[PDB]
Scaffold this active site. Structure first.
Site, mmCIF file in Angstrom:
data_model
loop_
_atom_site.group_PDB
_atom_site.id
_atom_site.type_symbol
_atom_site.label_atom_id
_atom_site.label_comp_id
_atom_site.label_asym_id
_atom_site.label_seq_id
_atom_site.Cartn_x
_atom_site.Cartn_y
_atom_site.Cartn_z
ATOM 1 N N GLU A 138 30.614 12.235 5.424
ATOM 2 C CA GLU A 138 31.103 13.106 6.487
ATOM 3 C C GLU A 138 29.961 13.516 7.394
ATOM 4 O OE1 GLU A 138 33.343 16.375 4.923
ATOM 5 O OE2 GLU A 138 34.884 15.125 3.993
ATOM 6 N N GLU A 147 36.828 9.721 -0.638
ATOM 7 C CA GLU A 147 37.006 11.080 -1.177
ATOM 8 C C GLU A 147 38.470 11.471 -1.071
ATOM 9 O OE1 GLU A 147 33.681 13.795 -0.052
ATOM 10 O OE2 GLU A 147 35.019 15.475 -0.427
#
Ligand code: NA
Lengths: 275, 297
Positions: B151, B237
């Site tokens: 991210e 994720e």
């Protein structure tokens, strides 16, 4: 609905869990509007029939008042409907309807007895909270008989792939039925196919006629159309012919019904199924 | 040096395979701490985690979001657990107001008189730390991919224009350090179809890499597949369901705890049944790294 997601039927009941208010002064189109004190109602709903008779109204329309009514429904659209098309269908609203979705004005509709629809796709929050609002204005005197007021017919949502049969998009003709009766009957179909994607589609239709209720194993006629390219953002009328093998007539004493199913294929896969 | 004989494959259509056998990556993300022991990487503590994970049916660990202790690599080597070793969280921009995180150091150069050893020192810290991890674990049979970030564009300030060029730099450094493993990352902006994410994922794939999407649902997995036919993808994720142990007086999400029923997840995530259902139906989704396998501090 309270939540919209896959996989409800293509067209699904949207009657439940609305909120209602009778007021000709309130302005309640914003999604953040506080409607906590409003009545909870399931549709279909008539807000004239709950008000009192009054000599100040007209005998013609049962001495009952009309008025301005507001309907709000807040519902979730799950993330799993992200690239799908969503429309709301009204079978009737009496009368002078105004529709907003998430604060955006979509349009209006005067006549209290005809069905109409609104595409919701462009304003939808996928994976979020959504609010549809309908303002209704039965300003009297509007009728020679008791009309009622509000969303007095069913409401549905229609969810489809980007490639799909248009709203009410199949027309069927059997012009030689009287002569062909009992033998092979020619069905001439026209189907509007819309490509609301960003790429051209190679479209074939697979159309089947079978007894209502009713599986495709018992079809009496099918056809697959030749491939037609429909461009991104365009639609086309697709003509097709079904030869129906001795269909059973619809008569007063024996009202036989068939389902005419249209599967839309692009490449090799079915993207939409319209009955 | 410890060694093991195996080969892997990632296919855009059919997912992951080990030694020529198709295999689902049934994974968890794991942070490094060992609970009441704090950050201490004690070998039995780490081994105990892997044992408990295996009993659940786990076959893979994503070392979120930083190199593992060597002890974990040792253990997975002996136990037969597939490791996605992540090297970085943020890149050259700090996250969450963390002014002293590695975002401060990532792109700094290394002093000439700094004698520190382990990897290349001719460019930035990012290159040193990336190579140093690869140098340590390049022979370990358990490690199957290098993850280069997580991210990277989240929780940061300013433009993301320079991120595609940074990703390509890291991809090149990795391919040059070890040609035998795919590189990857976990990007949460794919679900939002950011321009930078498309550019970055296309560059991954061009260098024999695999694209991790954070927190996509079924509908989004499908969009990725249709939009990027050449990508080999997996859920890097997933879920982020939030639950306490042993709580039953509500089934939905006062005592500062949460229900143990699987009906509670963060806004961006999904409950366990949902994140699994969406993945197991799709051969082209190689697997899932559930956030998380163990609670962490
Ligand atoms: Na822990």
């Amino acid at each position: 609905s309270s939540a919209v997601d896959s996989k409800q039927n293509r067209t699904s009941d949207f009657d439940a869990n609305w909120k209602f208010m009778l007021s000709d002064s309130v302005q309640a189109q914003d999604p953040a509007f506080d409607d906590s004190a409003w009545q909870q109602v399931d549709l279909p709903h008539d807000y004239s029939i709950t008000q009192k008779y009054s000599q100040s109204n007209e005998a013609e329309s049962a001495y009952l008042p009309g008025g301005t009514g507001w309907y709000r429904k807040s519902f979730t659209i799950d993330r799993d409907l992200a690239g799908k098309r969503i429309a709301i269908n009204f079978d009737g609203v009496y009368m002078n309807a105004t529709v907003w979705f998430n604060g955006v004005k979509l349009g209006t509709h005067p006549y209290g007895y005809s069905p109409f629809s609104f595409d919701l796709t462009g304003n939808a929050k996928f994976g979020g909270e959504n609010t549809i609002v309908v303002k209704v204005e039965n300003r009297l005197p509007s009728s020679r008989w008791y009309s009622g007021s509000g969303i007095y017919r069913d409401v549905t949502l229609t969810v489809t792939d980007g490639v799909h049969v248009g709203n009410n998009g199949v027309a069927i003709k059997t012009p030689s039925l009287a002569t062909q009766n009992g033998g092979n009957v020619t069905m001439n179909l026209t189907t509007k196919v819309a490509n609301d994607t960003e790429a051209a589609a190679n479209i074939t239709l697979k159309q089947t006629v079978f007894p209502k209720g009713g599986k495709t194993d018992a079809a009496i006629g099918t056809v697959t159309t030749a491939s037609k390219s429909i461009a991104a953002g365009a639609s086309a009328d697709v003509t097709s012919t079904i030869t129906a093998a001795s269909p059973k007539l619809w008569s007063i004493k024996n009202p036989n019904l068939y389902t005419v199913r249209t599967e839309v294929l692009n490449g090799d896969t079915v993207l939409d199924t319209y009955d | 040096t410890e060694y093991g004989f195996r080969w892997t494959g990632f296919d855009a259509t059919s997912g992951f395979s080990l030694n020529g056998e198709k295999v689902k990556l049934k994974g968890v993300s794991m942070h490094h701490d060992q609970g009441s022991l704090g950050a201490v990487a004690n070998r039995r503590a780490i081994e105990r985690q892997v044992e408990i994970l295996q009993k659940m049916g786990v076959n893979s660990i994503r070392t979120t979001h930083n190199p593992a202790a060597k002890a974990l690599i040792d253990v997975c080597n002996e136990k037969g657990v597939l490791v996605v070793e992540e090297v970085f969280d943020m890149w050259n921009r700090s996250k969450n107001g963390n002014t002293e995180d590695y975002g401060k150091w990532f792109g700094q150069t290394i002093a000439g008189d700094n004698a520190v050893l382990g990897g290349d020192k001719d460019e930035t810290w990012a290159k040193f730390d990336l190579t140093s991890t690869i140098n340590r674990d390049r022979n370990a049979p358990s490690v199957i991919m290098w993850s280069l970030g997580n991210e990277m564009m989240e929780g940061i300030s300013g433009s993301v224009s320079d991120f595609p060029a940074t990703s390509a730099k890291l991809v090149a450094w990795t391919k040059a350090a070890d040609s035998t493993r795919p590189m990857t990352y976990g990007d949460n902006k794919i679900k939002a179809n950011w321009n930078e994410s498309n550019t970055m994922g296309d560059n991954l794939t061009a260098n024999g890499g695999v694209v991790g999407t954070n927190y996509s649902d079924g509908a989004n997995y499908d969009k990725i597949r249709t939009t990027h036919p050449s990508w080999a993808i997996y859920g890097s994720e997933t879920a982020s369901a939030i639950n306490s142990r042993g709580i039953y007086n509500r089934t939905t999400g006062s005592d500062k705890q949460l229900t143990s029923y699987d009906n509670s997840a963060v806004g961006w995530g999904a409950v366990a049944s949902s994140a699994w259902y969406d993945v197991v139906q799709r051969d082209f989704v190689a697997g899932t790294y559930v956030w998380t396998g163990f609670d962490y501090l």
